[PDB]
Amino acid sequence: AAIDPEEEVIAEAEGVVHLHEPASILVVKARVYPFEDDVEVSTGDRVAPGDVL
């Protein structure tokens, strides 16, 4: 997306998106939990082991 509508990138047809040339790489020590539908916690919440994400 972008400021002006004519600067936006819209997909022509079906395809897969790859990300190249990042401005920087951020290494964070964290555990990544992928989900599917709905997340029960929000950003900033604090979680002990065993809490449902």
Partner: protein, 327 residues
Amino acid sequence: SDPVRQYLHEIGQVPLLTLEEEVELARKVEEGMEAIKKLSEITGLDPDLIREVVRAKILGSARVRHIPGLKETLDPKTVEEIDQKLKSLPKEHKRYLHIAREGEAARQHLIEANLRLVVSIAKKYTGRGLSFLDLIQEGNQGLIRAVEKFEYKRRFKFSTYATWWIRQAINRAIADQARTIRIPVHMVETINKLSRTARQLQQELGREPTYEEIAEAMGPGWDAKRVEETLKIAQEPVSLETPIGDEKDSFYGDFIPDEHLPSPVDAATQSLLSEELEKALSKLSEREAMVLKLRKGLIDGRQIENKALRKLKYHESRTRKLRDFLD
């Protein structure tokens, strides 16, 4: 050791933003506010309430305090009630909660990132009656105002828009707090204008101007009397501890008498006055006594009236010794 050096150290801990990061943070903030408006449209709560709950959750458990704007007391109990009413919303609605959260986080990061600008702006305002750190703090308030009011759409670098608010707040502070006797900001503007004008006139005249010349360069409505009164109101008080002499010996306040408390001779003046008035009232008949003392208020503190008046005129011309009390 040195507070300023410590603040400058704590400021050098946060690295400066790259343009992409600036834009990103600003965007997250704006979209966060929009998301808060959205959640207000959904839940039906106060936008301020929701905002302060989101902020409460972002900052931490350390900071929860009653806000003067809110209609309710904000305790962690209530922030948990509201948080539970926000989390229980449908998914597509629950999205805006996350948006708002990351919005607040982005706001914190954005304010913390630009803090050096406030220093570099406030360093020009030194010696105007406010301390360096105070100027820095008010400038910080300006910076926060800037963050909340900033629009990244205009493609202007944040420093541009922020600088204006920083100068605004710093100047507001200098105008507000720098005088022991508080003078309203517009009147301060008037005074400063008068001073600059006088400096100009004296610069061109090779001497200090009179009140009339200042009145001339001031324009319409301005005369000598107004200039004099304005300079009179611009006078700052002097300290009682102002040192008198070369040594540490005495203070300027030791030479000032107390004009309030009656000296023993004044209490004795009231005493002797009430006494002499009581004793020379022997003329009084009882009715005229109570009524004329009610006339002059000698009882509760607040035709026969005329006869008592006349009798008092009679006894005034008598002893001729009460003149002393009359100054």
